[PDB]
Coordinates of C-alpha atoms and ligand atoms in Angstrom, one line a residue:
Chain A
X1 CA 11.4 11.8 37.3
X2 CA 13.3 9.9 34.6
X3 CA 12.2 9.9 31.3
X4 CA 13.6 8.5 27.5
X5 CA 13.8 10.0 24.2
X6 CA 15.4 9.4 21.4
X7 CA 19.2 10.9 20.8
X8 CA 17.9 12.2 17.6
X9 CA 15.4 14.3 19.5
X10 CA 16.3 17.7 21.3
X11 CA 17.2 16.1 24.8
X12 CA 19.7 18.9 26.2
X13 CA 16.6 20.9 25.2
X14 CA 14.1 18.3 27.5
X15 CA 16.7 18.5 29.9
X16 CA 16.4 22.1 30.3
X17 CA 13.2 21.9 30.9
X18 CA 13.9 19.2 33.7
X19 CA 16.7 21.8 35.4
X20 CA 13.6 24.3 35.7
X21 CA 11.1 22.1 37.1
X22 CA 13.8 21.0 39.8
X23 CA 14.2 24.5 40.8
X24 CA 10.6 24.7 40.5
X25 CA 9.2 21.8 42.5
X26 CA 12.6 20.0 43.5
X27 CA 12.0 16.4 42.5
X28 CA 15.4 16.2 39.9
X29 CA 14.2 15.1 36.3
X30 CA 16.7 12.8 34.6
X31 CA 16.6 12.9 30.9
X32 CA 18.0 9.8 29.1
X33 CA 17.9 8.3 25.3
X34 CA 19.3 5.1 25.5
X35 CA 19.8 3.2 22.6
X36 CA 16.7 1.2 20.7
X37 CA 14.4 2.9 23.5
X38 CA 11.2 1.4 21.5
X39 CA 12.2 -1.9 22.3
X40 CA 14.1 -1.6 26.0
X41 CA 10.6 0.1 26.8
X42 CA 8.7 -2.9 26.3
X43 CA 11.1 -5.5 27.7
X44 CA 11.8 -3.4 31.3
X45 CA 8.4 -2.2 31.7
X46 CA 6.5 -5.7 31.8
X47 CA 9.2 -6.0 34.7
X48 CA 7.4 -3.0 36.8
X49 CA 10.5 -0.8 35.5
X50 CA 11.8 1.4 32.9
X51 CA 11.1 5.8 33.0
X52 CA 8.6 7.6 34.2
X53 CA 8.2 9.2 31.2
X54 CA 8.6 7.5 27.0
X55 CA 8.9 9.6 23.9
X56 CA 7.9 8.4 20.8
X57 CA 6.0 7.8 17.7
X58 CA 2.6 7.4 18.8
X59 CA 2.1 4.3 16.7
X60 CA 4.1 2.2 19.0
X61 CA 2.0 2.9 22.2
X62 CA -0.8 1.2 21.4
X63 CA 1.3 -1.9 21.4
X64 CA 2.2 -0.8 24.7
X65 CA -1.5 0.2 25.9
X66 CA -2.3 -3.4 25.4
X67 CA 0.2 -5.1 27.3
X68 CA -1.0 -2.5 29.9
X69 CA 2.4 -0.4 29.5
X70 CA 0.8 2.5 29.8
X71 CA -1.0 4.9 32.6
X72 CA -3.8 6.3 31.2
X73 CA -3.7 10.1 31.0
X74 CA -6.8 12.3 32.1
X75 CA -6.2 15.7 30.9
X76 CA -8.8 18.0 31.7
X77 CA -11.2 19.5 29.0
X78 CA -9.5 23.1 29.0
X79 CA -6.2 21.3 28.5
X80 CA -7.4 18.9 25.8
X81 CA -8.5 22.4 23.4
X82 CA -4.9 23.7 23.6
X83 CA -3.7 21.3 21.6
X84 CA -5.3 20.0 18.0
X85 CA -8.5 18.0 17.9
X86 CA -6.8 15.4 15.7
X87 CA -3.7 14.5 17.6
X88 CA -5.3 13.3 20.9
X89 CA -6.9 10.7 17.8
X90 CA -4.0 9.5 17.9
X91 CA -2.7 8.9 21.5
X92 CA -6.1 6.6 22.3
X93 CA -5.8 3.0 22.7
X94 CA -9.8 1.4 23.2
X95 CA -11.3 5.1 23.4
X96 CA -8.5 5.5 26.5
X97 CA -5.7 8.4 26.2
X98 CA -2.7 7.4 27.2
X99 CA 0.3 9.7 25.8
X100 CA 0.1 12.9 25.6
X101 CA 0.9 14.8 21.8
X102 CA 4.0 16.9 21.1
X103 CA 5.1 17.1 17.5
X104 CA 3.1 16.2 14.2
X105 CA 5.1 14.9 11.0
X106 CA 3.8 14.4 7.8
X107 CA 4.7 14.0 3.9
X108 CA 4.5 17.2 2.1
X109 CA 4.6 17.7 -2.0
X110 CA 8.2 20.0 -2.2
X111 CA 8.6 21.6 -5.4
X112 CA 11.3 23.1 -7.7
X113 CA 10.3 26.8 -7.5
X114 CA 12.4 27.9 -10.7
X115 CA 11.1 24.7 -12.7
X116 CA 7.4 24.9 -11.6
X117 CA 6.3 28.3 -10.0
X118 CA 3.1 26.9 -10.2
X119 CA 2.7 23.3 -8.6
X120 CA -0.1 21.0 -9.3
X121 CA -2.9 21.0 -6.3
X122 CA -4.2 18.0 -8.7
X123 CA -2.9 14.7 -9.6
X124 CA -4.8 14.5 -12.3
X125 CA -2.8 17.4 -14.0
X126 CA 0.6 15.7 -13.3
X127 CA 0.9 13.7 -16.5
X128 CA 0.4 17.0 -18.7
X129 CA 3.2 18.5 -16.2
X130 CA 5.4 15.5 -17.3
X131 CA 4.8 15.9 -20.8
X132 CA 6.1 19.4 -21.0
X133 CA 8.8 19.0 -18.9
X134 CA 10.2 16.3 -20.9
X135 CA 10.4 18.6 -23.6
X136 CA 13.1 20.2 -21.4
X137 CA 15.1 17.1 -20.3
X138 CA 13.7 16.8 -16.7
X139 CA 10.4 15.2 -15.5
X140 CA 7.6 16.6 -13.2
X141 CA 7.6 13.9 -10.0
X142 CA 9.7 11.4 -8.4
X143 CA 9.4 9.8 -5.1
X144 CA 10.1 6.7 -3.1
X145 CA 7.6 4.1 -5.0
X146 CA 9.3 1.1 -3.0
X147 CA 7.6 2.0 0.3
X148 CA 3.7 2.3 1.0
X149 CA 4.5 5.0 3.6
X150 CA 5.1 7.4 0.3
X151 CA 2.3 5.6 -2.2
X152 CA 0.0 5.8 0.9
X153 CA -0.7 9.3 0.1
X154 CA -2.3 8.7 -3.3
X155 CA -3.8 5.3 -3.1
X156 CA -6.0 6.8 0.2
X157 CA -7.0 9.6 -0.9
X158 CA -10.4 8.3 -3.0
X159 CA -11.1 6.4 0.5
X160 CA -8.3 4.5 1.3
X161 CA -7.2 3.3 4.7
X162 CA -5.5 1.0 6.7
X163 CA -8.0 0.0 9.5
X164 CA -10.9 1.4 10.5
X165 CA -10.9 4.4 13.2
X166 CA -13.6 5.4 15.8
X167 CA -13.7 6.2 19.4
X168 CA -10.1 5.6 19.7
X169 CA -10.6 2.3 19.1
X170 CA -9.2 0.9 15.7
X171 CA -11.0 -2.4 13.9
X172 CA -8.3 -5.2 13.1
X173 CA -11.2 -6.7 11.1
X174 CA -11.8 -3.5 9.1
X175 CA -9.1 -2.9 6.5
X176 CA -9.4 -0.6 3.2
X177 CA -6.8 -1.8 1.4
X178 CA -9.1 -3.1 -2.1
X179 CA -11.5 -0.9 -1.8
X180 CA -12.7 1.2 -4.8
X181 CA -11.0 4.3 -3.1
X182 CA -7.5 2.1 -3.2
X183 CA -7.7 0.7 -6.4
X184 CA -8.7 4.1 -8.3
X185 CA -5.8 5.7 -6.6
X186 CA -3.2 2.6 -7.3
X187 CA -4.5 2.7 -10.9
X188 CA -3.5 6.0 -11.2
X189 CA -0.4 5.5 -9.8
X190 CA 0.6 2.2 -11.9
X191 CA -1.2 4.6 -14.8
X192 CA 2.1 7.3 -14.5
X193 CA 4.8 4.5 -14.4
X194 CA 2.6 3.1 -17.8
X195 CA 3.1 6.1 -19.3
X196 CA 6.8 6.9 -18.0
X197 CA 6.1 9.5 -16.0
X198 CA 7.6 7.8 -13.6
X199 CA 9.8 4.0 -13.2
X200 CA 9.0 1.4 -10.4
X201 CA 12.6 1.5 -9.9
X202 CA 12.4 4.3 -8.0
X203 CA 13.7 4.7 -4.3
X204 CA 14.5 7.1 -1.8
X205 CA 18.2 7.6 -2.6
X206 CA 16.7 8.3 -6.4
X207 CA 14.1 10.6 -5.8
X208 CA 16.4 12.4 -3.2
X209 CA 19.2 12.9 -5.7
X210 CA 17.1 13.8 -8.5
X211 CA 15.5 16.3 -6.7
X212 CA 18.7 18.1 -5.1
X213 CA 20.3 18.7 -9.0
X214 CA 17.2 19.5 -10.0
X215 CA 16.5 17.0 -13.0
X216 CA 12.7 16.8 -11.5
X217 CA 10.6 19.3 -10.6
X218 CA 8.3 17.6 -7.7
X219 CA 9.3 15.1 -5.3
X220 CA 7.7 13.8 -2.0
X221 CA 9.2 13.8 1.8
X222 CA 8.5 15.0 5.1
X223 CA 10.8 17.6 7.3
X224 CA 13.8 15.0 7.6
X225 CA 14.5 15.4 4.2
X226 CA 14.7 19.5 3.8
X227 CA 18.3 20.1 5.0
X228 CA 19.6 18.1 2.7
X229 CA 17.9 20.1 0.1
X230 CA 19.0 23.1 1.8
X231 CA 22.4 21.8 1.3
X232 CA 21.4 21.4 -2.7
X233 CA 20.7 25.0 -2.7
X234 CA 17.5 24.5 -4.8
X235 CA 15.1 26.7 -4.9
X236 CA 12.5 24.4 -3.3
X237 CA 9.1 25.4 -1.8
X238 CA 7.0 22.8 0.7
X239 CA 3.0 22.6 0.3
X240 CA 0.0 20.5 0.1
X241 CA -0.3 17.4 -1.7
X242 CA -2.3 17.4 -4.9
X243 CA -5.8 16.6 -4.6
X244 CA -7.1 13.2 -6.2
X245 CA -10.8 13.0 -7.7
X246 CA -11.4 16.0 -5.4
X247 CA -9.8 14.5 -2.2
X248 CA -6.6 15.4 -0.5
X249 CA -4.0 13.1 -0.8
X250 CA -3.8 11.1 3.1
X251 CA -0.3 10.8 4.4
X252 CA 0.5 9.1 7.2
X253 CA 0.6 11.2 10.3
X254 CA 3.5 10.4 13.0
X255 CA 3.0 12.1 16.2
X256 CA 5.9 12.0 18.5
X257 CA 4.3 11.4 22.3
X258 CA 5.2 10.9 25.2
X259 CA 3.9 8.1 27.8
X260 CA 3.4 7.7 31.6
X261 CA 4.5 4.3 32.4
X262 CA 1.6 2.1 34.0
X263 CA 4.6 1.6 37.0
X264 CA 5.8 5.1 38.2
X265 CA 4.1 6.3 41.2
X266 CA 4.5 9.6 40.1
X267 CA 1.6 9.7 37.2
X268 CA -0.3 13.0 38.7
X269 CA 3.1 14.4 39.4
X270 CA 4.4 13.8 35.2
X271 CA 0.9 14.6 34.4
X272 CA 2.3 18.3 35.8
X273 CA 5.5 18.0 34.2
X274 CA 3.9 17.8 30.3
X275 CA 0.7 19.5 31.4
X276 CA 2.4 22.5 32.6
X277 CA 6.2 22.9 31.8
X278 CA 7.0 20.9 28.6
X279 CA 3.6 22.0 26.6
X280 CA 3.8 25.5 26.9
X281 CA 5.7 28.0 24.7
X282 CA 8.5 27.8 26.8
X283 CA 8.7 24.0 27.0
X284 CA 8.8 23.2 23.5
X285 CA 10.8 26.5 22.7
X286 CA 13.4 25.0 25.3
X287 CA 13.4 21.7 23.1
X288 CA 13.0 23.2 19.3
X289 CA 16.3 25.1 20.1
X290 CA 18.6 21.8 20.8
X291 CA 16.9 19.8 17.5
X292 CA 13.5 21.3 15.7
X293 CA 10.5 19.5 16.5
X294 CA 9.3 20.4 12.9
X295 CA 5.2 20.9 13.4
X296 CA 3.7 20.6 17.0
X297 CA 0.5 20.0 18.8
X298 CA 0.2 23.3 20.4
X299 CA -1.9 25.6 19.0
X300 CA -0.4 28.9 20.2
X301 CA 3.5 27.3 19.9
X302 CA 2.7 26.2 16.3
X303 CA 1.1 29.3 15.2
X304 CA 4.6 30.4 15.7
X305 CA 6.3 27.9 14.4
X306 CA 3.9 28.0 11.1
X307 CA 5.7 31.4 10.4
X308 CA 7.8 28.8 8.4
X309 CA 5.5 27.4 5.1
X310 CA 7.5 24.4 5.8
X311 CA 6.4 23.9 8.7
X312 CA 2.9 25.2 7.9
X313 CA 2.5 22.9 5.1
X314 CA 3.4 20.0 6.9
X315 CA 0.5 20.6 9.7
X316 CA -1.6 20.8 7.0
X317 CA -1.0 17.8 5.4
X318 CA -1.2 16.0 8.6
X319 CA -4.7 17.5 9.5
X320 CA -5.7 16.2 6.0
X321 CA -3.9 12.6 6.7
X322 CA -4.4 9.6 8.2
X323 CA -3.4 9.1 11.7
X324 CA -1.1 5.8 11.4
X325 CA -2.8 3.0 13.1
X326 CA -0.8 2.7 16.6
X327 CA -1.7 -1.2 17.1
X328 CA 0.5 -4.3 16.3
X329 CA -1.3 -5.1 13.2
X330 CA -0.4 -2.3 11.3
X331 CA 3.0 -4.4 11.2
X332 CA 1.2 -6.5 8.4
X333 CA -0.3 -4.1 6.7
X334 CA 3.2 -2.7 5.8
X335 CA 4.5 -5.8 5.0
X336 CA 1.5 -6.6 2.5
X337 CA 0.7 -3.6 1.2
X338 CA 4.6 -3.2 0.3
X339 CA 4.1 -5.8 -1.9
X340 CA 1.2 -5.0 -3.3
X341 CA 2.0 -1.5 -4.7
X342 CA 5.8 -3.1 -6.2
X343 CA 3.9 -5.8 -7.8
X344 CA 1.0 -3.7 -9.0
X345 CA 4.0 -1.4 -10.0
X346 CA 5.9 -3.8 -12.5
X347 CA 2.9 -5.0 -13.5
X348 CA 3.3 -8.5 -11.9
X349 CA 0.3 -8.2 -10.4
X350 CA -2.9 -6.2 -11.9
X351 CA -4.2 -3.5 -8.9
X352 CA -7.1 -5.7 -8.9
X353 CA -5.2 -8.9 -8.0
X354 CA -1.8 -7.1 -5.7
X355 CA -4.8 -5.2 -3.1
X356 CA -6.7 -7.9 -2.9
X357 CA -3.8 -10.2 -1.7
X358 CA -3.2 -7.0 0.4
X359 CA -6.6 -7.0 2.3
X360 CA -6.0 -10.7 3.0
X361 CA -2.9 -10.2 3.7
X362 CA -3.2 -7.0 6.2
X363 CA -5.8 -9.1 8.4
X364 CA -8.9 -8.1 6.7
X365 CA -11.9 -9.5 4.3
X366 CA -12.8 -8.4 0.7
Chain B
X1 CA 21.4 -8.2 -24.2
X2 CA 22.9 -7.9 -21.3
X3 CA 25.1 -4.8 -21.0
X4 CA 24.8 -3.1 -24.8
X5 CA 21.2 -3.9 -24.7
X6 CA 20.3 -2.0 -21.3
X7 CA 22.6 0.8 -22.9
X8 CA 20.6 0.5 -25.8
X9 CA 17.1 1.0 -23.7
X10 CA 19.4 3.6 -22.0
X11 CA 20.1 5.2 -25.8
X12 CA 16.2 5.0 -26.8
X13 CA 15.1 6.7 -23.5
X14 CA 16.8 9.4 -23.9
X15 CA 16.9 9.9 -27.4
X16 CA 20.3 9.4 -28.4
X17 CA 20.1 8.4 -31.7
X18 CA 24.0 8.7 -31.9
X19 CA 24.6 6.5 -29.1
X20 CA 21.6 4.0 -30.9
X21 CA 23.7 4.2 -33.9
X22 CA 26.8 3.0 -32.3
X23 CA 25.5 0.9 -29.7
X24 CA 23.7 -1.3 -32.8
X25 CA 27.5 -1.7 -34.5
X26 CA 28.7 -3.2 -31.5
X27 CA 26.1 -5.9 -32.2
X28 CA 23.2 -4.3 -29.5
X29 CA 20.4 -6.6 -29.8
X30 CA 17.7 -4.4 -31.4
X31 CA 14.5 -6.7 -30.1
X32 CA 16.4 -6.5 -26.6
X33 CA 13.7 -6.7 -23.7
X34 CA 14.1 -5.5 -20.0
X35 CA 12.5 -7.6 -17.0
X36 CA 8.5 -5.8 -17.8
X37 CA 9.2 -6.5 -21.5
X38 CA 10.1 -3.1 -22.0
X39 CA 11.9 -2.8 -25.7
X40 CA 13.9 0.0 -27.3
X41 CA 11.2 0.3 -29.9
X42 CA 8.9 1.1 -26.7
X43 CA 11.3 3.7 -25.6
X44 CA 12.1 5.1 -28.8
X45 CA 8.5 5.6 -29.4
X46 CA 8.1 7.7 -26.1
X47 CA 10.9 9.7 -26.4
X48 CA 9.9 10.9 -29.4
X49 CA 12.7 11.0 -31.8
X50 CA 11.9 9.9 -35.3
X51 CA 15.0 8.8 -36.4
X52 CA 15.9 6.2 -34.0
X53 CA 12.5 4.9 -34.3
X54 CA 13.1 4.5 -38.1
X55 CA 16.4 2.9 -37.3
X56 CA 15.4 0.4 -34.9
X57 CA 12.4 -0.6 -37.3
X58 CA 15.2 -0.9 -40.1
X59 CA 17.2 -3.3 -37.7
X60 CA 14.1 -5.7 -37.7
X61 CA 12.5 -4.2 -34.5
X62 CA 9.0 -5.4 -33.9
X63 CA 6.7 -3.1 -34.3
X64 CA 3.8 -5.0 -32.1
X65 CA 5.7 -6.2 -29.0
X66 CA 4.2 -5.6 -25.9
X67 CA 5.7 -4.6 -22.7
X68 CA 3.9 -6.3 -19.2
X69 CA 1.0 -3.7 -19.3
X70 CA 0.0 -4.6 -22.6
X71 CA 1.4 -1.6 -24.3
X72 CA 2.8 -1.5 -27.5
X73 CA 5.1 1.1 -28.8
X74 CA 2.1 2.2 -30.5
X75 CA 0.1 3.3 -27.2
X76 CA 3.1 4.9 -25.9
X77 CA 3.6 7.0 -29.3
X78 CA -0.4 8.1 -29.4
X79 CA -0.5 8.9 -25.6
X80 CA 3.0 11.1 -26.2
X81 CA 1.6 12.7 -29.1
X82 CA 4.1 11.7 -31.4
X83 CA 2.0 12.4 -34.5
X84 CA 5.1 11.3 -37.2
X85 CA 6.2 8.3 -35.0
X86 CA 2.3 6.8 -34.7
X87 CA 2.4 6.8 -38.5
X88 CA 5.7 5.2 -38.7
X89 CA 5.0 2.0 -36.5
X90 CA 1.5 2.0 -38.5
X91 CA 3.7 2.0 -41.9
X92 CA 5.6 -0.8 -40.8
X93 CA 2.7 -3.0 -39.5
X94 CA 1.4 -1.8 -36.1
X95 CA -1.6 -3.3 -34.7
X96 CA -4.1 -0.4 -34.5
X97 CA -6.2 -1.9 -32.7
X98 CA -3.8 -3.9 -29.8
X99 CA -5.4 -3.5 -26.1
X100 CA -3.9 -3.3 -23.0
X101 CA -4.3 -4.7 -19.7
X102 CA -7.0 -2.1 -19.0
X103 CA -9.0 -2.8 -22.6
X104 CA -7.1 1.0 -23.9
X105 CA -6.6 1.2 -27.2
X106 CA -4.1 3.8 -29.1
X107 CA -7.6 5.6 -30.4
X108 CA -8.5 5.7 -26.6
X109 CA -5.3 7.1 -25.3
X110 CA -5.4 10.4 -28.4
X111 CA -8.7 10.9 -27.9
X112 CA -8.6 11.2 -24.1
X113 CA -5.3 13.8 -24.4
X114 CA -6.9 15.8 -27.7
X115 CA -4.4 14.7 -30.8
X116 CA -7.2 15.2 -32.9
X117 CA -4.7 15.0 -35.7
X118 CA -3.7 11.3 -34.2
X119 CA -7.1 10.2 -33.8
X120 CA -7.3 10.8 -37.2
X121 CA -4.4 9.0 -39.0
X122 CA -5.6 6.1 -36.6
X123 CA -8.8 5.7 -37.4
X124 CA -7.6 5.7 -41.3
X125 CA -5.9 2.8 -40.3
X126 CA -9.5 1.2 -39.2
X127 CA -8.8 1.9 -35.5
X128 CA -12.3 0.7 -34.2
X129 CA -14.8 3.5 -32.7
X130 CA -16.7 0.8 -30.6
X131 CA -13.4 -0.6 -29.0
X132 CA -15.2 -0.5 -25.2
X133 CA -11.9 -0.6 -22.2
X134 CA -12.0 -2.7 -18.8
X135 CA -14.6 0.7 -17.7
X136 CA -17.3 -0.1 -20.7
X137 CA -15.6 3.2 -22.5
X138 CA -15.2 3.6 -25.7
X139 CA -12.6 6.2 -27.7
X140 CA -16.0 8.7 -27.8
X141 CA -17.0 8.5 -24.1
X142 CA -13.0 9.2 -23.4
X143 CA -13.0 12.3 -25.9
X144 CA -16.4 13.7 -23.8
X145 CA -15.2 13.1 -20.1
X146 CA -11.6 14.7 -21.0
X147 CA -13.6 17.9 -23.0
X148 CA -12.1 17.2 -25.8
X149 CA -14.6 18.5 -28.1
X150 CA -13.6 18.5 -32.0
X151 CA -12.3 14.8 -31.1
X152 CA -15.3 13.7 -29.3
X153 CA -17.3 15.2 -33.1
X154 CA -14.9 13.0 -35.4
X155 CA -15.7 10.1 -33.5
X156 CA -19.0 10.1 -33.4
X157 CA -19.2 10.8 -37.4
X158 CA -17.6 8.0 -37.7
X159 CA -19.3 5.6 -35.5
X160 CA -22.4 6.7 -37.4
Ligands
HG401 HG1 19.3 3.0 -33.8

């Protein structure tokens, strides 16, 4: 068994794992995180090489599904229940599983405790927030506003989305990008840098270091971001994203997971290897120790895990997001929508005019 | 202006009017303008200070320029609440009635947060009651959907 995963994931951790199933079974179980794996993956395994076994973010697979990368998985029906309905969604390529879930990430709305005791669970109450905050010299929200992965949030949650979901089998024709759902929830968003409750101007380095000397009260990022805020020693609690006209806000859900590759002859024997030693308390215990795996797909491990709100919030906000799309397209919705929400932003486009361009622009029709 | 005018919108933001007062004697452009035609005058008027808004209006700021939204310093001064400044910029000329991108009017944007008092000195000024936005709203329908009730009253008085 050889199997890659990113050196920024717990691999001593997976490797442990690997020592026991040795002395469990014998075959040795190499564990390996070579450098731009994503990419290698791709280039070795269209060659009939490459691991047995790929970690990563789910959204990549489906680029690999369709270049027939991939061994489809066949987990049986008491397995499937042990993990969360919604992240098998997101290991389907043409209503096929093929990856098996491990950990969930999402965006979470992390708040100033001593500044705001009482977040918003509304976007519509933000802009009073602002106002009296102000009063004191410090504002109520900042976040990354240059990338749709942290405007996504708002914009979908009136019935936004990239492309169209069903049957694990995503529409490349189908986008929701100008939409009355996206263009309410733009609006609103272009409505708070209007009325300087926020600037246009603001990035990830911004929001980041506003947040950690506590000039704003609210800011917007997923688990990545809380030890540097540990580090701030602010007094920060993580929760749900405020609601908009009665929805929950739809972040972007990233599921790390991990593939059988279409060329090892051991498929039934890795199907045993996730099936049975890494998704189990143990097996993800094993890994959470060397690097936290923040929110998993295992019910009974994450009900453990969820004994940290941080954690618990983020699951969540993932169960109320939107899988991310795991097919090539989604490359140009990114690039469009990017554009769209900047321009909409400084006003050089109206929201009408930037998501329109958008929807054209993402591969779909208005 | 280069770099005393972005100090300037710098000054304005954060209501400084020290830092205003200086900034103009080192020959700060007072009708400076950022890339979204952002203006001291529009910064001055959100920040709320009084003074500064006075001084910049002194200096020969104008009181009707409009930033890439369509805002005036006006609209930012009625949706902040800034009772003293709205009358100020209407002193020295404001257009009551100047609409932004969206068709929102000052009278729109104090009715739909309840400055009753606002609406008021506004619609003095001839602020017009049948002013309908991008959404067919008028300043009324605004003042009902937000629960605004006293404003919502005055409004339709006065449309009568
Ligand atoms: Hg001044």
């Amino acid at each position: 068994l050889v199997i890659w995963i990113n050196g920024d994931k717990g691999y001593n951790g997976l490797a442990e794992v690997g020592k026991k199933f040795e002395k469990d079974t014998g075959i040795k179980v190499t564990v390996e995180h070579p450098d731009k794996l994503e990419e290698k993956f791709p280039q070795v395994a269209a060659t009939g090489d490459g691991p047995d076994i790929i970690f990563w973010a789910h959204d990549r697979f489906g680029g690999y599904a369709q270049s027939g990368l991939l061994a489809e998985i066949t987990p049986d029906k008491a397995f499937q229940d042990k993990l969360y309905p919604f992240t098998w969604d997101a290991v389907r390529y043409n209503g096929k599983l093929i990856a098996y879930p491990i950990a969930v990430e999402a965006l979470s709305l992390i708040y100033n405790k001593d500044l705001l005791p009482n977040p918003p669970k509304t976007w519509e109450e933000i802009p009073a927030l602002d106002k009296e905050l102000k009063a004191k010299g410090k504002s109520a929200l900042m976040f990354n506003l240059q990338e749709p992965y942290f405007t996504w949030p708002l914009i979908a949650a009136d019935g936004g989305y990239a492309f169209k979901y069903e049957n694990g089998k995503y529409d490349i024709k189908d986008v929701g990008v100008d939409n009355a759902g996206a263009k309410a929830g733009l609006t609103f968003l272009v409505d708070l840098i209007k009325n300087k409750h926020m600037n246009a101007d603001t990035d990830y380095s911004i929001a980041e270091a506003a947040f950690n000397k506590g000039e704003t009260a609210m800011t917007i990022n997923g688990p990545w971001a809380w030890s540097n805020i540990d580090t701030s020693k602010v007094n920060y609690g993580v929760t749900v994203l405020p609601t908009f006209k009665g929805q929950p806000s739809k972040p972007f859900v990233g599921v790390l997971s991990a593939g059988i590759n279409a060329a090892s002859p051991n498929k039934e024997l890795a199907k045993e290897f996730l099936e049975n030693y890494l998704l189990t308390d143990e097996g993800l215990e094993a890994v959470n120790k060397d690097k936290p795996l923040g929110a998993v797909a295992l019910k009974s491990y994450e009900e453990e895990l969820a004994k940290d709100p941080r954690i618990a919030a983020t699951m969540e906000n993932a169960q109320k997001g939107e899988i991310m799309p795991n097919i090539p397209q989604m490359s140009a919705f990114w690039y469009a929508v990017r554009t769209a929400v900047i321009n909409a932003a400084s006003g050089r486009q109206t929201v009408d005019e930037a998501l329109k361009d958008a929807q054209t622009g993402s591969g779909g029709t208005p | 202006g280069s770099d005393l005018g972005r100090k300037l919108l710098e000054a304005a933001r954060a209501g400084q009017d020290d830092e205003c007062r200086i900034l103009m004697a080192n020959g700060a452009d007072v009708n400076a303008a950022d890339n979204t035609g952002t203006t001291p005058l529009h910064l001055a008027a959100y920040s709320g200070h009084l003074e500064i808004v006075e001084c910049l209006l002194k200096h020969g700021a104008d009181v009707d320029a409009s930033d890439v939204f369509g805002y005036t310093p006006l609209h930012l001064a009625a949706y902040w609440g800034h009772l003293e400044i709205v009358e100020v910029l209407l002193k020295n000329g404001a257009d009551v009635n100047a609409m932004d991108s969206d068709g929102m009017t000052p009278l729109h944007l104090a009715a739909k947060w309840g400055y009753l008092e606002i609406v008021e000195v506004l619609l003095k000024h001839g602020a017009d009651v049948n002013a309908q936005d991008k959404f067919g709203k008028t300043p009324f329908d605004l003042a009902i959907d937000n629960g605004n009730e006293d404003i919502a009253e005055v409004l339709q008085k006065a449309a009568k």
